Write a protein that binds this ligand. Sequence first.
Ligand SMILES: Nc1ncnc2c1ncn2[C@@H]1O[C@H](COP(=O)(O)OP(=O)(O)OP(=O)(O)O)[C@@H](O)[C@H]1O
Ligand SMILES: [Mg+2]
Length: 1350
Amino acid sequence: DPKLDPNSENFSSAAWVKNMAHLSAADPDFYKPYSLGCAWKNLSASGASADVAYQSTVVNIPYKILKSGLRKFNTFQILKPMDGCLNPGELLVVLGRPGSGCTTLLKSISSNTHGFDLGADTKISYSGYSGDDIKKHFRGEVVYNAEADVHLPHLTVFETLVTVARLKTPQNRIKGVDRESYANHLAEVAMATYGLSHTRNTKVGNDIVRGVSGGERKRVSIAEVSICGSKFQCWDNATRGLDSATALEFIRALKTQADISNTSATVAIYQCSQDAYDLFNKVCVLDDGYQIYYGPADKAKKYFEDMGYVCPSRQTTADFLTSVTSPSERTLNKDMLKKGIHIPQTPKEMNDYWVKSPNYKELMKEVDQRLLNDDEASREAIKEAHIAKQSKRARPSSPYTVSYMMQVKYLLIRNMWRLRNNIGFTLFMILGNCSMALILGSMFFKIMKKGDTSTFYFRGSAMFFAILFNAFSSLLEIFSLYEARPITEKHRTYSLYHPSADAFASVLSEIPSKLIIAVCFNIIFYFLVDFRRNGGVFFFYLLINIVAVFSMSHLFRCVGSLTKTLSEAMVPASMLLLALSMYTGFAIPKKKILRWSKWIWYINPLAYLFESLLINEFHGIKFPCAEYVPRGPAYANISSTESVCTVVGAVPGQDYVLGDDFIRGTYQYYHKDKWRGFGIGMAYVVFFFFVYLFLCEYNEGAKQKGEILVFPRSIVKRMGLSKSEAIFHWRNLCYEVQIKAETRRILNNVDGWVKPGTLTALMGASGAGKTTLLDCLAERVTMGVITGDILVNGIPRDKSFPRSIGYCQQQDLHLKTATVRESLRFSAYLRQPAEVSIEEKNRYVEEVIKILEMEKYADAVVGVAGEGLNVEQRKRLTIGVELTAKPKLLVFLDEPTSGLDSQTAWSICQLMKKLANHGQAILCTIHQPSAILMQEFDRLLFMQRGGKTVYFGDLGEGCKTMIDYFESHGAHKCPADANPAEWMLEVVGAAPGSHANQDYYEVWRNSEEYRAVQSELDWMERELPHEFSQSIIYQTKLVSIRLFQQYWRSPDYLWSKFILTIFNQLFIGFTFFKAGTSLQGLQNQMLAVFMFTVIFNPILQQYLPSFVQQRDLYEARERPSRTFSWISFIFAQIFVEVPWNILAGTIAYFIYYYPIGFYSNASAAGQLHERGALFWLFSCAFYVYVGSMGLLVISFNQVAESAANLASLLFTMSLSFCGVMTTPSAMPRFWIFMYRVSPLTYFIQALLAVGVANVDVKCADYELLEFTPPSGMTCGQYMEPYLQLAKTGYLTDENATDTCSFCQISTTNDYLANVNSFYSERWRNYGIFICYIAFNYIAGVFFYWLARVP
Ligand SMILES: Nc1ncnc2c1ncn2[C@@H]1O[C@H](COP(=O)(O)OP(=O)(O)OP(=O)(O)O)[C@@H](O)[C@H]1O
Ligand SMILES: [Mg+2]
């Protein structure tokens, strides 16, 4: 009964673990009990130095790389020599100020040391194993839980836990159960023993996606680590966000499992009750890298008090130890100074005192024997116990409990759950691909039916374009590879599974979509374009199409797994797409690919597959010639030696134009075998699948290096408020949200007020509606429906309210790059009243910097959590960013003091009390406040599970009023030495495994205190005494400057965009270097312009994820706070992205226009200086337009994948109805509508016109067709009748009679007009194109308001 984990009425973790120990001790031969500790000598770590740390940026990256090479061909020492031994079954607790080396120590002992590197002197021993042998075989018996709560935002809690449970279900589990049931039950127990059972089906969420609360997210990570069952745990920062009851229960769970299962655990906790601290066996203290004390937990005070300090009567032991490391709170023994004995004050001298202290001697006496202890039996049990723990067929020398294919199965189920969550994008993929099949099939339907020479070109074009559209679609899979990277790194550290298992699982998860897409697209396309013979001919094409799809998908995944970000991937991706575009053998045939760059043909899968497809679609099938050179009624009695078939490879004077001869000529595919393409294609598919798996596992990573300070080069190289009268009050506030089709009410009749000249706490268990209440009050709720009335002075809050409060998120939402002082300055400029000059605002910002003690890092770079700024620094920045705003009605504080050292907690509480004394009304939420913090609070609002008020009234001088209230209505007396803040939560039963004697919500509702507060509120309802601060243009200026500094100082995006343009356009231009002006040369000069636009997809998609990131950050904190309106945000995006695109187009001009030879045509025609300028303008316009389209598509999409797909689909529609794809003369139906409206039409017509217009052609011998004219007549007289209707010329020999060679076209204007391209049209095209850009930005600005703005 007490161990059925879904039975919340009775479940008791201790019972479950004791029972499982009784079961696992029953047959030690089968369960193989074992033990694991450690012991370390002279542990020292060192890392980078300020001489090399800088804020990388576009200008400095080249020099930075050069100096990095020099560095490879004064390192900051972080952990100065340490020691200690940790016997199995004994907890260890690490204490120190934030920045003192705690997490680095934990990472060091658990052989998880990415980033820094240990000293050569260090010596670690996991009871016989060296550090490396843990990585090589047993990584999994030593688990480090980083402070960062990293999860997939959308995967619910139960799925998150059950996946790892599955992955860790041992063999030799209870010898009566199957794998699935055991995994499910293990997940249920793990999530019931940590109070997570009511979040069974809620999104784990993240700092942006609203899901489980921060404390619940931390507990999800704790439970995930717990399910593992490792015998050595290191908890980086366990109690960040946990209340003072759940934290105690977590520590008790560790103690229980340690004393029952010989587990060891080293937990670095920053605030811990006196009773919680009593549970630990060994204590470690750190100060700026030095080890001050290591030994029994209970002797800590008895040892430090011997040094010369003294404990205040109401300071807990852990707070005392942390205090000794702070020069302010520390207190010296006045008597001992009188005696003349010195007392170490600086960390170095405390280390000197300790190393000389006897305690260090008895520490060494035991460390040495554990490090020198080798029995060849202790490590035998671990080996025997481990291999027995694995699946039947797993490799014994592997650190993963379950073999490969099982890992793939479970990760595949997880990825299928991800697909379920994102079903919208995949459904869009399928629908859009089908619709593009039906659209392209429509652009040819009525043409192919002719069966004459018309098929020899159009069917090939349609085939090539279907393949290239498949290529475009495959490029969208790069987006998937990046979401799960941090999570797979996390799981790698636990040795759950091979990363290649996750890669394989992603591939499999995507296969079904690709088969459905391929079969539908191919059946439709074939049914209305190609040969239409439903014999095996069709099925062969189906096979080759699917093989091409798979080959492209694997190639793109393999290249996209070479980088750290999507933007960096797009450089390989664009190069590869472009190569797979031109070099397939239809764009530019084999005989034509220049000798300079030939090798790309052979390495091209699509080239071989297209060769096979053409063999299929032309071998042994004949069509009749059309389009003879001399035609019309002017000729009769023609002769075989007197007419010519314009189709290349045609037999002379005969209609038997066999397809074999065709392909032999045009594409040189003269070989017989069609199966060649299939084999080499499948070889590519398999080989690159294996390369992708190797790349994602053996040489891939996304791990953070550490909280280093960046300090941009420009800096390092040179190195309250007045009164407000309005009260704030609310009543009956009730809030309900929808989960799994079953709504849950998370606030219930919460009523209370906060009025000026007061400082009102807000405590309650994690999972109570603290943050939910605050959001409901600050107008930040996004889902559900609130009821009841909030007010200000008895009037509903006006539109000016959201800016008049100051609300500090419990999550830290700031730019990666904007420095601290810069962030404060930005906020002060935009939010503080406009009547004060910038000088005053800047002075006040510096005053805040002084007040909050940030000066020694005011210029650092915010960076990412876990990567660029400590937790204490990040929280101080988060509250300063709002102090500087000068709020005028309230100041909320969601978590001003949670998860950071007790001394800094007290400092922030002193700041809060000062502000409240000055006049501000504060309402802060508090977790684990020591008794010395509770004495600063004036009122208290107390919440039960489910967001039910359980107290609201004064705390009193010594917390007397709340104590009296709770004891007055029935509750066990609070001990004199007990902390009131913790006794109160013990009574309410906030602990996951504990329940109260009665439901105190009813108690409160029935109390005279509740009637008192209700009467207060009713009276105060009888009370009686712009949206943004700055002008819209001003805030637009500021946000645009910030975003310019954001693209600057963010090299991965701009520098990648350049590299992409540079190399891509270089590749295009040189593929078509100086194409000439012949028929085949002119064809290349048309293709190059036509191929200039294929880059639309990758260059557009580089931008989308960056914009998604800025949009998430903006709408997370700065939209509800009304720092600057949405229109300002969009205008900043536009004004910042434009000029960079202009520069990109400028460079593309110079690296593209000249090599192809356009300048030669412009100069020969005598119009150089105009055509150069016009071509430059069109390049700039194209790049601006690509940016604009990227902005338009993303405006109304939550996900970049769907937006990118929409952009690619629109691009393909605009492109298929363009160029020579289908001659506009051949499409007189209504489908011309998209032709006239598409922008690629105007761009390409204008660009061909400028590039190749008004110059003469020079046919080469291989292109000159020839015929023998009628006897006696001369060629000129014989062709003049044709010429009057032909409006062409270039007859080779006018007066010859035996034979004359001819060219279909004489003036290039003829060829351009053939595609409806005109030189006189150039300017109107530019006007239309810029108008399209303008409309596109108008629609992009509109759709944001339509969709994202509430
Ligand atoms: N990889 C690194 N290279 C150089 N210095 C580092 C590195 N990581 C951290 N530091 C520096 O070492 C000091 C201590 O960092 P530490 O790893 O102890 O963070 P912490 O105190 O554990 O904070 P948290 O508990 O939030 O991780 C910091 O001042 C930081 O600048
Ligand atoms: Mg919260």
